Amino acid sequence: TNLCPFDEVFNATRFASVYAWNRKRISNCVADYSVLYNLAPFFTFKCYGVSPTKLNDLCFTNVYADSFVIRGDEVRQIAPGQTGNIADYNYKLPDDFTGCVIAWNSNKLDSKVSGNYNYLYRLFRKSNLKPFERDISTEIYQAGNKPCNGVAGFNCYFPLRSYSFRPTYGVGHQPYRVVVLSFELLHAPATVCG
Amino acid sequence: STTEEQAKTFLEKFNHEAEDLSYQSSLASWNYNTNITDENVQKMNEARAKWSAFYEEQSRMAKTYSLEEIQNLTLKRQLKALQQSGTSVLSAEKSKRLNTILNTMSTIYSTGKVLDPNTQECLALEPGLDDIMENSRDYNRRLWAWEGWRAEVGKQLRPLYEEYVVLENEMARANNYEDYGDYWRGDYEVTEAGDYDYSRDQLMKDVENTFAEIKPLYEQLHAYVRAKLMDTYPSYISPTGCLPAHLLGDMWGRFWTNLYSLTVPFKHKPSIDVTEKMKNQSWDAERIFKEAEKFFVSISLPHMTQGFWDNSMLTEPGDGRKVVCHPTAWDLGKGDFRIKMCTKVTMDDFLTAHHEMGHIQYDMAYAAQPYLLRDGANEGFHEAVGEIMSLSAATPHYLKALGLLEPDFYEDNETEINFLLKQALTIVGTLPFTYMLEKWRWMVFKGEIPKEQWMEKWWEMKREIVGVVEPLPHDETYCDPACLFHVAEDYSFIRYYTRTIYQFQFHEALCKTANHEGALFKCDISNSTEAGQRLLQMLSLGKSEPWTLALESIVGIKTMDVKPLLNYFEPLFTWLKEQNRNSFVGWSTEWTPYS
Ligand SMILES: *[C@@H]1O[C@H](CO)[C@@H](O[C@@H]2O[C@H](CO)[C@@H](O[C@@H]3O[C@H](CO)[C@@H](O)[C@H](O)[C@@H]3O)[C@H](O)[C@H]2NC(C)=O)[C@H](O)[C@H]1NC(C)=O
Ligand SMILES: *[C@@H]1O[C@H](CO)[C@@H](O[C@@H]2O[C@H](CO)[C@@H](O)[C@H](O)[C@H]2NC(C)=O)[C@H](O)[C@H]1NC(C)=O
Ligand SMILES: *[C@@H]1O[C@H](CO)[C@@H](O)[C@H](O)[C@H]1NC(C)=O
Ligand SMILES: *[C@@H]1O[C@H](CO)[C@@H](O)[C@H](O)[C@H]1NC(C)=O
């Protein structure tokens, strides 16, 4: 039995940022989906394009696990056809999506009293992201009619800010860990059955 | 690249930076306030300095974008709020002088000390002179304390005030404001919104009209208080003259609460106090806030967060840690709402908990808005919402529902009259004083009063409007208005009149929409969900919309109307007309205790 590398993602020790999220490709495996229940209050367990009523006894050619950390208020932008700043200039899901988004509260792990500046996100970019695109480039943004030249002064802005989580914040600003399980079944393959 | 999108990008950067810096500063301040050690003072000072430097540099940068060539209204309001530079326009020479003058005045007021006859001790403003004014009923002692506190402070403060006025006037002139009074009135100004427009000049006319409508009730109350004070000092008080300044129950006359004991209508009837029931039922500190949250849930307003219960200081620590016991509601930001209060098991703390919970509810309501648009619609909106909750949480109906007052409780006309009398003292005593003081300061700033009439015009206006007369003549050496804390600390004093009017406007509108039958002074909005959603429409606007629109949403009219205030005191007006049949309802300027 090819048990999937689950328990190495949902039970990781360092999720990535949301400007450069983490992508893992799972294939040629058996995917048990009863391991999730014991993890945490996985209050976000939305599923789009499929039926989550334990209908995962099919076969899929590919599974994509996209992991990152965001704010509590921003876990509603991980959905088809949404707008904001975790969608326009960050991880953007397609309008037609066949997967499950699982987001749960990880306040005790990713929040330090002094602050946790390890996580970051992007505030400015020229145009919105095409679905599943990544942009790790850090070039000085230009909002005016003058060259940046590599210095962030007036109208020249560094692209990525920092979340800076603290344990005393409200639930709307506490860090939530998000894992997106995209599914994929091509022209009749039989790779990953669960 | 249009200017509009450049301003948008600049504000998007500013919001994110400012929110974090403000949260850090507020957390440092909270730590200092709940833990009084020099290290916390250092941390608080450093955080405040960082915030001030960041705000100054951002305000300097924001001016580059012209206020013109802007289309969106919200962006225009945000940029106008950010662009105000305050006193930075003054040169290097004048700014240091102004800061030195303000610090000197604050230190002189704080360092208060008046000696006593027989060289017994040395009495500061608190708690010696304050207790003497509040409790003593001896004409000589009160007169001596009042005169000493007036002279010892005013003689020093007089020279500084003229230079302060000149400097502040110059600063206002530089900022295109006519004078400091115009700058202070510019907090009630709405531009570019037809049918919702307000001007700095119209505020004076509105205040004058409201006070002119108020005046008859204050005249009846003042005549009754004079008649009751005649008994204690028959020789010193004329039947048809102004009252002595030093016999008004406090140092300045701002409140008349301390005169209740003398002037209680029915001494035999007691007041409604539920301290004994709370003690008998083992009501602890947490229970009071639990009941306040229950009331706010009843009105269908949201619950309290789980950070409120775990992080707040809802009782005195009991450890060695030293705290400031002044009850405050903290909105640190980013979802952190707390309350600091040294709770005791009393009815007063019950009402104070309701008030602070109303402030927390307003803070939670307007959280959606951007950083620069998270406050009350005007400077007087934030306290009316707190006051209406404590108004509701004192009716006998609420205290019977909660189980404190016994079900067989019977209401007396006399007890209600006594409650209305105490409320009328506390609420109506301050209105003429506040209006007169603000009018005097406006006239001084406008230059309509020469420097040799600062004490003639002050007492003349006090005689005409307030109905109070000085005990002893004072020359230009004395500066009576500067003895007050607010005047000596450069604080606006016109937010205590509009707040009082808005509170009763809100408490009439909500009681009307809550389907209540009866006198307004006995109204409860608990278990009513229409009032909660009529209130949430105003509490969630913040500063995004003009204050005229925010006021119209809850009450229905875009103007400050004092009709609900008189509607509240309707039962008392008839009783005060009945009791004042024989006495003369009026005062004459001419008579003075000096003669
Ligand atoms: C707001 O809502 C209702 C009144 O509309 C109050 O809650 C409950 O109302 C019922 C009325 O049927 C009462 O419960 C009863 O209490 C007796 C004790 O006297 C008990 O023996 C009965 O079995 C029944 O439960 C009562 O007023 C109240 N429930 C409780 C447990 O107290 C509520 O008090 C209203 N709030 C205000 C501020 O008026
Ligand atoms: C009140 O402030 C004092 C310092 O001014 C705190 O005492 C220190 O607390 C830290 C923990 O953050 C310890 O590491 C230190 O050893 C403590 N002592 C000193 C001298 O720094 C105190 O903990 C604060 N009160 C509370 C309730 O936290
Ligand atoms: C993560 O580890 C805990 C350890 O007890 C385990 O209970 C949980 O099932 C793990 N999560 C998985 C397997 O998804
Ligand atoms: C101003 O911008 C906000 C941004 O969402 C928009 O909702 C609003 O309609 C705009 N108003 C005007 C008058 O352009």
Ligand SMILES: *[C@@H]1O[C@H](CO)[C@@H](O)[C@H](O)[C@H]1NC(C)=O
């Ligand atoms: C409350 O008062 C009654 C009076 O009869 C007394 O019996 C009871 O013990 C008291 N409860 C207390 C003090 O907790």
Ligand SMILES: *[C@@H]1O[C@H](CO)[C@@H](O)[C@H](O)[C@H]1NC(C)=O
């Ligand atoms: C209660 O109001 C006044 C005050 O005591 C009293 O004169 C009056 O008679 C009482 N009301 C009635 C209906 O008797």
Ligand SMILES: [Zn+2]
């Ligand atoms: Zn308050």
